[PDB]
Amino acid sequence: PAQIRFSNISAAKAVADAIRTSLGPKGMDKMIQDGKGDVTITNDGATILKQMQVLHPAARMLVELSKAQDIEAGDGTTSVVIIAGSLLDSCTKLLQKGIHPTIISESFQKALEKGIEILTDMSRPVELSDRETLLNSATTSLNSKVVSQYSSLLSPMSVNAVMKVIDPATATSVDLRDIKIVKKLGGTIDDCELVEGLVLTQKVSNSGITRVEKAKIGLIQFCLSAPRAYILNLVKQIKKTGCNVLLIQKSILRDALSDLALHFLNKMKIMVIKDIEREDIEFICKTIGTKPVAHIDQFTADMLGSAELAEEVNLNGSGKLLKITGCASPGKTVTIVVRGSNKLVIEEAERSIHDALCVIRCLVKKRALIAGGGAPEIELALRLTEYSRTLSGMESYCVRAFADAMEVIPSTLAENAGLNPISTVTELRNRHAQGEKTAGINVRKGGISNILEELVVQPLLVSVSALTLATETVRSILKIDDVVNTR
Amino acid sequence: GTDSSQGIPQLVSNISACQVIAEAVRTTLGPRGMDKLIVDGRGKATISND
Amino acid sequence: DEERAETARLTSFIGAIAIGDLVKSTLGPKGMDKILLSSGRDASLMVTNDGATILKNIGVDNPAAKVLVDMSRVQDDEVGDGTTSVTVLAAELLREAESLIAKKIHPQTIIAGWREATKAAREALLSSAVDHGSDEVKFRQDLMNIAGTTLSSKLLTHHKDHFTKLAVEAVLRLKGSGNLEAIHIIKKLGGSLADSYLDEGFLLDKKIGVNQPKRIENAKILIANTGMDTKVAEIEHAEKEKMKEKVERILKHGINCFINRQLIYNYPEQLFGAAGVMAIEHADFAGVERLALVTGGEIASTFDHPELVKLGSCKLIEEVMIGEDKLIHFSGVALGEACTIVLRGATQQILDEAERSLHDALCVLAQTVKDSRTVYGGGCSEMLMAHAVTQLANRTPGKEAVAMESYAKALRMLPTIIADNAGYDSADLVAQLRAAHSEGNTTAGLDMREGTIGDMAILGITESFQVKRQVLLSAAEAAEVILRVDNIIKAA
Amino acid sequence: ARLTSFIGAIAIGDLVKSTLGPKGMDKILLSSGRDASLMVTNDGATILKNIGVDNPAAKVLVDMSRVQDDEVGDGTTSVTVLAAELLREAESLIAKKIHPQTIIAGWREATKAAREALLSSAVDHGSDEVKFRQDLMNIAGTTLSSKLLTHHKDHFTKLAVEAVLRLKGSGNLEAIHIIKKLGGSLADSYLDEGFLLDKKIGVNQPKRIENAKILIANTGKVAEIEHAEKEKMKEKVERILKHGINCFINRQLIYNYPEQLFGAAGVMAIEHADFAGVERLALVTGGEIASTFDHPELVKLGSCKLIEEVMIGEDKLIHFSGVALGEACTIVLRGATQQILDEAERSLHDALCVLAQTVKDSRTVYGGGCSEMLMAHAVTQLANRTPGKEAVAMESYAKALRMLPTIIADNAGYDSADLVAQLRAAHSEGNTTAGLDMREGTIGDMAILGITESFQVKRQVLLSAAEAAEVILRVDNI
Amino acid sequence: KSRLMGLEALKSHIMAAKAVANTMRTSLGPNGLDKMMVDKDGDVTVTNDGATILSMMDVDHQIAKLMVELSKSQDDEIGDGTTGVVVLAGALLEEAEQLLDRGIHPIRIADGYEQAARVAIEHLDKISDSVLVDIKDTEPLIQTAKTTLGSKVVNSCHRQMAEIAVNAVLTVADMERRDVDFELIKVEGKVGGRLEDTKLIKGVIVDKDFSHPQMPKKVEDAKIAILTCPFEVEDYKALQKYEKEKFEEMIQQIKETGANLAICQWGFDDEANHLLLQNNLPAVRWVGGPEIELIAIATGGRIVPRFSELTAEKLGFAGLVQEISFGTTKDKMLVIEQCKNSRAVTIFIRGGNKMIIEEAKRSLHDALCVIRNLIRDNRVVYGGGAAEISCALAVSQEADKCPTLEQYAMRAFADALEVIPMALSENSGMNPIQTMTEVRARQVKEMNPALGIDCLHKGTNDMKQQHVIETLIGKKQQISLATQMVRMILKIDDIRKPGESEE
């Protein structure tokens, strides 16, 4: 019971301390050639955790925390591991003092909700949509990259895309669902456009007319095959109705539209694009309103999707893209048409636009903002220590044990920035106890000061979600007391 | 470890060899002789006095 | 696979005690979750506070422990929750018995003591199993008590209100005799545990599309054989001709809904819609059984003898779309009993867990609708059994007076471990509860929400008699079954 | 180091366990290989004395049995077995994570109830109520358990019943006296009035003397001062003729020129007896002890009236009769082996000590282990009443009280798991007068069969066993 | 190296063989500790009968293989108490080793045990206080079947179960030849049910399907077939012409012949049977093979699977008109009970436990031996060890007026029989020495031979009031077929094992 709980504690603490130095922007890169040749040179600990050979349960639950924190807010991936590992390390004192893990876990729950309610009103919240502070958070996020010169190229485009559809999803917050994204290799970085409706990037090359104002859309996933019976009837149905733009899928076989049916579908010259992407197929259907139907006898008259302008148009001079407006309910995931001749200006632009998405959905699910970089952790370690002084019973140390485990985030931020960690942490505590909350460690210049002047700030829900997930998994691993193999 | 292939060891080995095969059928002499049980190896139990 | 005398009963007791220890911590509403690895390649590091899935997932090769696992399966299919406590009590009785064999007492005397001790506990359960007025004068909160104590370590604390409301409409309407066939549980993904509400049917929509009407009223409904249609090509073609002759035989009814179980491709569905026929493919077969009695449509292989009016007849069947998901409410059944419950939550284990736990809750509620007598839980009944067996051991002479006393200890070790997994103090409170129960009579018991001695009839922590008698009897019988059996080909 | 203390004490309690009760089986006191040859013994008291005990915690239990030894005599084995059984009970409670101090407090408040529940069944016998005989002969016989001397057991109870008229001042255990020779049997003891030393002047020294005023002597150009010291010891023998005495204790060695000159002056000089008999010579005859005897000139001597020395049947069978306080009722057996020398003396000390406890206070409880079952049921009923963890600590205190009539039934050869449990069940309703009979091996009325035991040894066992338990339980290290 | 032979061979086998007896000597008596049975495959059950224990166990030494071979040749003889043959095997082998310590040749020990058995069986006939009028003994047959069920709560339904037993031995009672044959197999055990639903049906209810799954099952007529007829679009049109042909020739050959309830064992299409249903006659598809005798005896006929030989006097035959739901949650099974009596008779068991199925077949067969031994030889002995103590006293008495060294066999014999009341008293949780010698002293002071060991923990040691009753054939066969194998083991000395390469 205790001998396996201690092994869970030690394994999760060891897998948390393997990425503990990578906290902060000065977090150094790693190299683990474990497995069969992994040259793992990266300063970000999320991809380090995704390549860690993990056999222990409690070591794998923090890898689950990493992906959970990346799903909820997209930032603070190493923080939810370091907080959890320091908490589980601090559980050993409570275990050896005599407290049962149930009391430890419920006192951590009490300390968690106390820390959430302490963080939620010590913020500097935004009052409106406040597009100026969205661009301010973009300067905190979309810059310090190679898209720093593409920051004004990319931030107000997404800001205006949320301005277009302030979409009712999780209390009118930013979903992954504003206006459908595409990306095209080649072009310049300035060749991004904000669209209204469906765009296709793939190569449709029709000499005839694909430019119909009432562009009727179907999704026939029935391609052509090789034994005339189950071959031409869908094209006869096309001649019946007149769906002039239809996205082709090769779900049946490989010869998708052979010249028998291809000239039949080039006697009116339908849009032809094959091998459509499976996760975006259902979003395309949510856009259009047609039915994703492969059975050619299930093609009905109510499968006729709507489109207004459908062209194989050379957008930006040469990009033969198929843009579509005028649908049933278009708008599937926030549009940044990533064009770039270089490859790094493709991938970093799209990755930073996803970063911008995961911070603006953080900025409006919870509409507050704090000064990041070790300041709220010191604030929690002060106020929870006072609360644990007020608290009675065996929980009175555990919340205190919750407090000191909060202190690893500034200290690592003190250590990775080269400062002497313990003295700078307690000097930060002395400054905060008589001064302000926003005092912390400016890692961007390497010095302890008021961060709200030096502008290293973060939305509140990153810290709240990281504390929630870390306390949840610490609670679970404390409650875990038995394992068994051999089913 | 005992090597016996010279002439007096030859005859001594021969008569020890007849003594052991005589002991293999020693008790079965007479009408009320003692039974000996052997098998085939696969489970064919044969009790005999012949 | 032969054994010896001292070794075989010892390793049998060790295997059974190890099984009871592997369901020890997952007991009561303070469960410490064990992790079930199945090493394989990517076995999910699954947490669970329910012990039935542990014993279902334990791969055990000690056959006495396999007998213990099988008796836990008998208790699992009998009542549902409580098999953890049954296995814990059985392994506790075996731990008690091997201490008696350490004192060199014959096992038959141990079984002879345990039998009359079990009979004394069985009548001491009736001594305090008072019938609450939750079905007599129709209290609702005491149905919530009995459907809260067996609902421990579960997800539906929001719509335990809805499950107890289903218990109210079960004692009012859905009693067949306490119908255990109406237990109809569905859910999909997206949201949390606060989305459970009423239905009366399963979730399969009109497979013609939205073109099929909603109110397809009078469903003459059964199972068909093959899809309808118009020298291997010619032999299947003449089969297509005979099957069109068969749709000419089924169209003269005037059906609305139908359940064609086999997978239906295009022109079968087209001639279904041309004949107004529904095609529903391989649902939960217990729900099709509710389509067979609450609605009417039984299972069938062919349909050559039922031809005109020889089907199941109902009044109203619809297939709707609510909440952008396949949510279909078969409103208008002939006998309104199989009220389905639809939820929309997060994980997929609740697809089995809510179904089995509503089966457990409705099983103990069916125990109440046969007999609403109940005792006060929290180990108060266990203290009553231990006290009665202790006094009967103080009266009984002979060697068997030892064998009862350990039995009473096996009762007193039951609420201790629930206190031990509570995190709260165990030995002192169980000792104070025992000393109080000796003279401050049986209305006092243990509460672990505050961790104290208290009046359980005031705090209302009830437990139905028909599950507790079942627990005591099954645990004692399993312990005596393995106690009779010593040294054979018993284990490897 | 708390476990090995329990182990060392449990081993000492086990090495008197199979000698418990008067069906006990003997152990071997083999020793250092010089002359260790053999020693069989049913007496567990002398077993632990000849044990070279290694663990110092077991030495504490040994000296607690030593405290029990000089108190009443027999009772060391019961105290040691009960204390080791309490420790074997307590180490099972320690492994269930209970603090030892709670177990000690539970021992204390359980031992209080077990002490008063002896007083609830305090039955007084008619030898100190209606001047009966056989009721105190029962306790005088069962204190003679694991022994042989049952023929003149009536002579032992005669020395008991003559004590309440002659040899009690306050139940005096100094007027008793035991000696024996070898050759013969149980049927040789009789009434004597002292030690066995004879007249020593020889065939001329007569038997009856007139008056024995009796104390201790001293002793009996360098050669001339040696003759002057001879003149001074010759001055002493002139100073003793004018006394008028007829016996004297001669504690220091003496050859014939002091000796014949003593006896010609009428001085019978008794050469260096053991001082325990000289205690009876000090007041029961009335002749004190000194080192010099210059200053007693007519007044500061001993005081007695008659001392006689006869020779009957192969002994130095001297009957020191006619003393001034005629109370030194001496047993002179002629036993079988050398073992009966200490056995008869120590067994009469053990018997007549609790017989003096009865002539102080003649209350008794029924023996055979039913009093142990009564204390067990009494502490079990108090265990069912009080809350807290200490209610567990009472229950194990019951269990050792179950083990004490168990072991008595165990060394009897009989089964002990059934009828001890049958006695425990029957004692709850078929009240206290029932009990275990070891000789016939059954359950019977102990008050009818008269197998009793003095209260002043049962209280001393039941108190001091828990007293030894609470000391060694509270010790943890070294 | 090593070569085990000689008298040390005889020492090694005995401690081998009695070890097997040491496994089984804890299973003696109804209070014996019953015992699991675990296959190499992984199956698990419980059994108390020692014959199943020895048979389904797999032994390593050839003496134990001989032991289970010979004791399976005792199962046809008695089948009840085959444990005691192994117990006496170990007992006589231990006492024979004790005699071998003094130097007696084992041939002399063997025929001395034979002479002691010739004392034993004849003294068993001397103490035979049997009641021979046990023919119309329907009231003491309750007590006869009572001790067979005594280990369980089956005595609480022995007012059903023991009366099933007495009606079973009533129905099989061929009053002159007195035997259960291979046809009179008395078992239909419905796995699933309760205590009383094991009840009185002398008929055939097998798990085969229906003619039609909604057919009116009321076939009162004895006009009933059993077929050896298998199934053995112009292909399907010719086969459908063969199908309506098979109708108008097999069923019309039936109309010539009289084989109406066509229970076919093989393939068929039920629409021909449905047109038979419109003509109101049944026919079942895909039925089982070897149940033709059990079905056909239900008025007195025998196996008739033929097309043509099933005539109006050798029809498929039916027992007694009753209509109960066979499959409550199961498919309702065949009502093959309408018309007359079943001699090869078979009873309705609805035992939910495999233990109560195993005992109600094999203890009923043991009744079918010992109530056969109420007709074949109506000689009962009061068991419970009383027969063994009464026998052993006379064996020791006949070990006095005989002048040979063979005498020491008989005193070794009688004490070996004392293992039977010892293991009865040991498995019942009492003192094994003192109880048996107290009963022996009670017998040497009171000449009643029905004073045994109180295994049931009832009032007294008198087996009259508790009716612990074996038969004299079951006792004599036990003692004689323990002696005939103790002589067999003692006559075998050298197991020169083949393939075990003697170097």
JSON list of N, CA and C in Angstrom, two decimals, chain E residues 259-289:
[
{"chain": "E", "resi": 259, "resn": "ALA", "atom": "N", "xyz": [-45.41, -43.22, -39.42]},
{"chain": "E", "resi": 259, "resn": "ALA", "atom": "CA", "xyz": [-44.28, -42.61, -38.73]},
{"chain": "E", "resi": 259, "resn": "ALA", "atom": "C", "xyz": [-44.46, -41.09, -38.77]},
{"chain": "E", "resi": 260, "resn": "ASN", "atom": "N", "xyz": [-45.24, -40.56, -37.84]},
{"chain": "E", "resi": 260, "resn": "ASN", "atom": "CA", "xyz": [-45.90, -39.27, -38.09]},
{"chain": "E", "resi": 260, "resn": "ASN", "atom": "C", "xyz": [-45.14, -38.06, -37.55]},
{"chain": "E", "resi": 261, "resn": "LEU", "atom": "N", "xyz": [-44.77, -38.07, -36.27]},
{"chain": "E", "resi": 261, "resn": "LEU", "atom": "CA", "xyz": [-43.97, -36.97, -35.72]},
{"chain": "E", "resi": 261, "resn": "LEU", "atom": "C", "xyz": [-42.53, -37.16, -36.20]},
{"chain": "E", "resi": 262, "resn": "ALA", "atom": "N", "xyz": [-42.28, -36.65, -37.40]},
{"chain": "E", "resi": 262, "resn": "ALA", "atom": "CA", "xyz": [-41.03, -36.91, -38.12]},
{"chain": "E", "resi": 262, "resn": "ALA", "atom": "C", "xyz": [-39.92, -36.07, -37.50]},
{"chain": "E", "resi": 263, "resn": "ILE", "atom": "N", "xyz": [-39.31, -36.63, -36.46]},
{"chain": "E", "resi": 263, "resn": "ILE", "atom": "CA", "xyz": [-38.19, -35.94, -35.83]},
{"chain": "E", "resi": 263, "resn": "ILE", "atom": "C", "xyz": [-36.91, -36.28, -36.61]},
{"chain": "E", "resi": 264, "resn": "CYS", "atom": "N", "xyz": [-36.64, -35.47, -37.63]},
{"chain": "E", "resi": 264, "resn": "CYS", "atom": "CA", "xyz": [-35.46, -35.68, -38.46]},
{"chain": "E", "resi": 264, "resn": "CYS", "atom": "C", "xyz": [-34.22, -35.21, -37.73]},
{"chain": "E", "resi": 265, "resn": "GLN", "atom": "N", "xyz": [-33.12, -35.92, -37.94]},
{"chain": "E", "resi": 265, "resn": "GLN", "atom": "CA", "xyz": [-31.86, -35.58, -37.29]},
{"chain": "E", "resi": 265, "resn": "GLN", "atom": "C", "xyz": [-30.99, -34.65, -38.12]},
{"chain": "E", "resi": 266, "resn": "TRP", "atom": "N", "xyz": [-31.44, -34.22, -39.29]},
{"chain": "E", "resi": 266, "resn": "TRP", "atom": "CA", "xyz": [-30.57, -33.57, -40.27]},
{"chain": "E", "resi": 266, "resn": "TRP", "atom": "C", "xyz": [-31.34, -32.44, -40.95]},
{"chain": "E", "resi": 267, "resn": "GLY", "atom": "N", "xyz": [-30.81, -31.98, -42.09]},
{"chain": "E", "resi": 267, "resn": "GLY", "atom": "CA", "xyz": [-31.33, -30.79, -42.73]},
{"chain": "E", "resi": 267, "resn": "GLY", "atom": "C", "xyz": [-32.67, -31.00, -43.41]},
{"chain": "E", "resi": 268, "resn": "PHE", "atom": "N", "xyz": [-33.43, -29.91, -43.47]},
{"chain": "E", "resi": 268, "resn": "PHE", "atom": "CA", "xyz": [-34.84, -29.87, -43.80]},
{"chain": "E", "resi": 268, "resn": "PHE", "atom": "C", "xyz": [-35.25, -28.40, -43.90]},
{"chain": "E", "resi": 269, "resn": "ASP", "atom": "N", "xyz": [-36.33, -28.13, -44.63]},
{"chain": "E", "resi": 269, "resn": "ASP", "atom": "CA", "xyz": [-36.93, -26.80, -44.64]},
{"chain": "E", "resi": 269, "resn": "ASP", "atom": "C", "xyz": [-38.32, -26.90, -44.02]},
{"chain": "E", "resi": 270, "resn": "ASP", "atom": "N", "xyz": [-38.60, -26.03, -43.05]},
{"chain": "E", "resi": 270, "resn": "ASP", "atom": "CA", "xyz": [-39.75, -26.18, -42.18]},
{"chain": "E", "resi": 270, "resn": "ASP", "atom": "C", "xyz": [-41.07, -25.76, -42.83]},
{"chain": "E", "resi": 271, "resn": "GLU", "atom": "N", "xyz": [-41.06, -25.26, -44.06]},
{"chain": "E", "resi": 271, "resn": "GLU", "atom": "CA", "xyz": [-42.31, -24.88, -44.70]},
{"chain": "E", "resi": 271, "resn": "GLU", "atom": "C", "xyz": [-43.09, -26.11, -45.16]},
{"chain": "E", "resi": 272, "resn": "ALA", "atom": "N", "xyz": [-42.39, -27.20, -45.46]},
{"chain": "E", "resi": 272, "resn": "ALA", "atom": "CA", "xyz": [-43.08, -28.48, -45.61]},
{"chain": "E", "resi": 272, "resn": "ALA", "atom": "C", "xyz": [-43.68, -28.92, -44.29]},
{"chain": "E", "resi": 273, "resn": "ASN", "atom": "N", "xyz": [-42.95, -28.71, -43.19]},
{"chain": "E", "resi": 273, "resn": "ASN", "atom": "CA", "xyz": [-43.52, -28.97, -41.87]},
{"chain": "E", "resi": 273, "resn": "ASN", "atom": "C", "xyz": [-44.64, -27.98, -41.55]},
{"chain": "E", "resi": 274, "resn": "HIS", "atom": "N", "xyz": [-44.56, -26.76, -42.10]},
{"chain": "E", "resi": 274, "resn": "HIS", "atom": "CA", "xyz": [-45.66, -25.82, -41.89]},
{"chain": "E", "resi": 274, "resn": "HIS", "atom": "C", "xyz": [-46.90, -26.24, -42.67]},
{"chain": "E", "resi": 275, "resn": "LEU", "atom": "N", "xyz": [-46.71, -26.88, -43.82]},
{"chain": "E", "resi": 275, "resn": "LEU", "atom": "CA", "xyz": [-47.87, -27.39, -44.56]},
{"chain": "E", "resi": 275, "resn": "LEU", "atom": "C", "xyz": [-48.38, -28.67, -43.92]},
{"chain": "E", "resi": 276, "resn": "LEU", "atom": "N", "xyz": [-47.50, -29.40, -43.24]},
{"chain": "E", "resi": 276, "resn": "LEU", "atom": "CA", "xyz": [-47.96, -30.46, -42.34]},
{"chain": "E", "resi": 276, "resn": "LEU", "atom": "C", "xyz": [-48.75, -29.88, -41.18]},
{"chain": "E", "resi": 277, "resn": "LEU", "atom": "N", "xyz": [-48.36, -28.68, -40.72]},
{"chain": "E", "resi": 277, "resn": "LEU", "atom": "CA", "xyz": [-49.06, -28.01, -39.64]},
{"chain": "E", "resi": 277, "resn": "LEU", "atom": "C", "xyz": [-50.43, -27.53, -40.09]},
{"chain": "E", "resi": 278, "resn": "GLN", "atom": "N", "xyz": [-50.56, -27.14, -41.36]},
{"chain": "E", "resi": 278, "resn": "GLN", "atom": "CA", "xyz": [-51.88, -26.82, -41.89]},
{"chain": "E", "resi": 278, "resn": "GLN", "atom": "C", "xyz": [-52.71, -28.09, -42.07]},
{"chain": "E", "resi": 279, "resn": "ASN", "atom": "N", "xyz": [-52.05, -29.23, -42.29]},
{"chain": "E", "resi": 279, "resn": "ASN", "atom": "CA", "xyz": [-52.72, -30.52, -42.22]},
{"chain": "E", "resi": 279, "resn": "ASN", "atom": "C", "xyz": [-52.70, -31.11, -40.82]},
{"chain": "E", "resi": 280, "resn": "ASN", "atom": "N", "xyz": [-52.14, -30.37, -39.85]},
{"chain": "E", "resi": 280, "resn": "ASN", "atom": "CA", "xyz": [-52.16, -30.67, -38.41]},
{"chain": "E", "resi": 280, "resn": "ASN", "atom": "C", "xyz": [-51.45, -31.98, -38.09]},
{"chain": "E", "resi": 281, "resn": "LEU", "atom": "N", "xyz": [-50.14, -31.99, -38.38]},
{"chain": "E", "resi": 281, "resn": "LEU", "atom": "CA", "xyz": [-49.22, -33.04, -37.93]},
{"chain": "E", "resi": 281, "resn": "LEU", "atom": "C", "xyz": [-47.80, -32.49, -37.79]},
{"chain": "E", "resi": 282, "resn": "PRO", "atom": "N", "xyz": [-47.07, -32.87, -36.74]},
{"chain": "E", "resi": 282, "resn": "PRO", "atom": "CA", "xyz": [-45.76, -32.26, -36.47]},
{"chain": "E", "resi": 282, "resn": "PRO", "atom": "C", "xyz": [-44.59, -33.05, -37.06]},
{"chain": "E", "resi": 283, "resn": "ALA", "atom": "N", "xyz": [-43.46, -32.35, -37.18]},
{"chain": "E", "resi": 283, "resn": "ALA", "atom": "CA", "xyz": [-42.21, -32.93, -37.67]},
{"chain": "E", "resi": 283, "resn": "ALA", "atom": "C", "xyz": [-41.06, -32.02, -37.28]},
{"chain": "E", "resi": 284, "resn": "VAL", "atom": "N", "xyz": [-40.10, -32.53, -36.52]},
{"chain": "E", "resi": 284, "resn": "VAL", "atom": "CA", "xyz": [-39.00, -31.73, -35.98]},
{"chain": "E", "resi": 284, "resn": "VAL", "atom": "C", "xyz": [-37.75, -31.93, -36.83]},
{"chain": "E", "resi": 285, "resn": "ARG", "atom": "N", "xyz": [-37.03, -30.84, -37.08]},
{"chain": "E", "resi": 285, "resn": "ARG", "atom": "CA", "xyz": [-35.76, -30.86, -37.80]},
{"chain": "E", "resi": 285, "resn": "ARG", "atom": "C", "xyz": [-34.59, -30.92, -36.82]},
{"chain": "E", "resi": 286, "resn": "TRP", "atom": "N", "xyz": [-33.55, -31.69, -37.19]},
{"chain": "E", "resi": 286, "resn": "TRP", "atom": "CA", "xyz": [-32.23, -31.69, -36.55]},
{"chain": "E", "resi": 286, "resn": "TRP", "atom": "C", "xyz": [-32.29, -32.12, -35.08]},
{"chain": "E", "resi": 287, "resn": "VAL", "atom": "N", "xyz": [-32.69, -33.37, -34.87]},
{"chain": "E", "resi": 287, "resn": "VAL", "atom": "CA", "xyz": [-32.80, -33.92, -33.53]},
{"chain": "E", "resi": 287, "resn": "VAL", "atom": "C", "xyz": [-31.57, -34.78, -33.24]},
{"chain": "E", "resi": 288, "resn": "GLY", "atom": "N", "xyz": [-31.43, -35.19, -31.96]},
{"chain": "E", "resi": 288, "resn": "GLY", "atom": "CA", "xyz": [-30.26, -35.91, -31.52]},
{"chain": "E", "resi": 288, "resn": "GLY", "atom": "C", "xyz": [-30.32, -37.41, -31.79]},
{"chain": "E", "resi": 289, "resn": "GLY", "atom": "N", "xyz": [-29.14, -38.02, -31.79]},
{"chain": "E", "resi": 289, "resn": "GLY", "atom": "CA", "xyz": [-28.97, -39.41, -32.17]},
{"chain": "E", "resi": 289, "resn": "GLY", "atom": "C", "xyz": [-29.47, -40.48, -31.21]}
]
